[PDB]
Every structure is written in C-alpha cells, then in structure tokens.
Symmetry: C2
Subunit: 130 residues, 2 copies
Amino acid sequence: RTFSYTLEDHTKQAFGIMNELRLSQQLCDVTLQVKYQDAPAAQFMAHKVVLASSSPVFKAMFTNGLREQGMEVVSIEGIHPKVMERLIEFAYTASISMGEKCVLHVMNGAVMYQIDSVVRACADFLVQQL
Amino acid sequence: RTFSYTLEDHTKQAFGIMNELRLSQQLCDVTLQVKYQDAPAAQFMAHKVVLASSSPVFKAMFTNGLREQGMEVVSIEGIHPKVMERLIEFAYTASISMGEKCVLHVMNGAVMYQIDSVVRACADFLVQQL
C-alpha cells in the first residue's frame, strides 16, 4: 500500500547546484572577510546554511537565536585566505586539494572550524610522510 | 607535490544537518504558505538555497535579481499541503514515501516543481501497476 523512492545521487547533484549558486553569488547571506597578517584581504560570499552543514563552528556562529536581518559580514583572522577558500570549497564540493607545503595550514584551519573529516585526512597525510 | 581528499559521505551528512536546521526552524528564509481547495492552510519554513538545489522552479522563483530583504512568504495553490510536505522532505533527504492512492498527486506536484527524479519514479510506478 506504500511506495518509497530514494535518489542516491540527489545530495551530490544538489550540492553541485548550491556550489554554482555560490560562485554566481546568488542567495548568499554571509560574506566572510578574511585578513591574515601580511596577505591582502579577501572576501568570500556563501550560504550560512551550507557552512553550518559542514562546520559546527559556523553552525554555532549563525544559529544564535532570532535569525538575522539580511547579508551579514563576518571578520575572520588567523587563517590565510587561501586556506579559507579551500575549506569553503570542501563544504560545497566534499573535496579539497592542496600542495604538500600547505597541508599543515589547511589542517590548522580545519581544526579552527571543526571540519573533522579534513582534520583526519590531513593528520593521516602528515603521519604517512614520516 | 599535491594532496587531494574526498569525503564520499559528506553531502549526505551535510543534508542531514540542513534537514535538522529546517525542522528546528533555524536559518530559514522562506515560508511556503499552502492553501489548497478545502484543506486547512499549512505553512512550511525552509532554506531558499536548498529548495533551489532540488527544483528549477524554486531556483527561478528565488534568484530573480538583487537578492532579498529577510524572511519571504510565498503563496502556493494547486498542491495539497501533504504533497508539498513530501516534496520538501525529498529536497532535504533524497527520499520520498507515499501511499499508492497519493502517487498521482505527488507526481502532479513533482511536475509542477520540475523535480525530475520524482517524476520518473512516480511515472514508472504508475506504469508497473498496469
């Protein structure tokens, strides 16, 4: 009496569209403004719900109480823009790529945003290089 | 010189959190107010970017031009609240379930929002019942 269907590729397909929307800067409600030491400032527009879905730190940051009035700007320090870029790309694509010289910095950034999957991968890479 | 990692379960995990946020009514920016013929009105809070990721119709509806001022209300007619509920659940979970008596209505609703995967599944179910 009951009919039930699951599209296994759905979440992959949907994230592809959400990443398209990020890159076309559509429906974005947070701008991450990243200024790290000597490097020129950079900014990244994104969707709070997507960032919250991949990082407990972003989730707590955006779900404070009575949900917000429009596009919010967030100041980020302590992470190089190139690392934040790769973490955002991970949240939107499930993949991350970097040079061996950046693995430590990406791991530092993944710890800062509690992106546990990237922490494990980076930790395991560092240890294999021993 | 280059290290690359993919978390295969990521998009599934992230959608689980986005569905949690929908049900706790956190970070939602659209309310779908559904009034269908005789049935009592119902409303559904959701995330525009998630709905846009699963339906070209919602995507076009929300990406008009200069992105909007806060929580938007959308009036929906022609679909029973129970069908809209199941379509929203599909967008957030990749699964949909219904009784055989509702398959035609769910398919009608999936055509209305161009949720092609649910259209195919419903069409194929109807034809197997022949």
